[PDB]
Design a protein around this ligand. Structure first.
Ligand SMILES: [Zn+2]
Length: 30
């Protein structure tokens, strides 16, 4: 019951955590 990121290699326990990670790490922060 884990989710993974398909940009880099970070994983989560709760999908929201993952979403946030991509939002603050990939998904254009610029
Ligand atoms: Zn990532």
């Amino acid at each position: 019951k884990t989710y993974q990121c398909q940009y880099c290699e970070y994983r989560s326990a709760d999908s929201s955590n993952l979403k946030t990670h991509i939002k603050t790490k990939h998904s254009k922060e610029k």
